[PDB]
């Protein structure tokens, strides 16, 4: 739709395939056209660049969708086989300074 939405906040979903290096993005339940193919052994940091126009800007939702692992499974080795999403204290937001 664009412009100003007020049904709910915009949900941008990032999907990474560690075995193929395919980066796909889902916006409001539909697949976006933009895709990226990365090299083997590439280390990818989840990142959000934003200019503040509100007291509340955005949030990192660490959930999961159908047929996909949560981000914590990829991040942590002990949780490699745990489908339940988790946010251990090691994971934290960093900013460029």
């Amino acid at each position: 739709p664009g412009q100003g939405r007020n049904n709910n906040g915009l949900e941008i979903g990032c999907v990474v395939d560690a075995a193929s290096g395919l980066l796909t993005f889902i916006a409001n339940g539909k697949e976006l056209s933009t895709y990226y193919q990365v090299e083997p052994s590439t280390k990818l940091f989840p990142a959000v660049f934003a200019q503040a126009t509100s007291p509340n800007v955005f949030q990192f939702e660490l959930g999961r969708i159908k047929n996909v692992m949560p981000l914590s499974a990829g991040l942590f080795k002990s949780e490699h086989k745990n489908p339940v999403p988790q946010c251990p204290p090691r994971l934290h937001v960093q900013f460029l300074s």
């Binding site: 007020n6 906040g9 395939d17 200019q51 126009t53 955005f58 996909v68």
Partner: protein, 34 residues
């Protein structure tokens, strides 16, 4: 719902970012960096 075997054998990972209503979205970029 989700196939447990597929989840056990897959290597696809997902996170989502919610831009709060009122934050101008063209000012927000989401993705991955190295």
């Amino acid at each position: 719902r989700d196939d447990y075997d597929f989840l056990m054998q897959t290597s696809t990972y997902y996170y989502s970012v919610r831009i709060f209503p009122g934050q101008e979205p063209a000012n927000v970029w989401v993705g991955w960096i190295t």
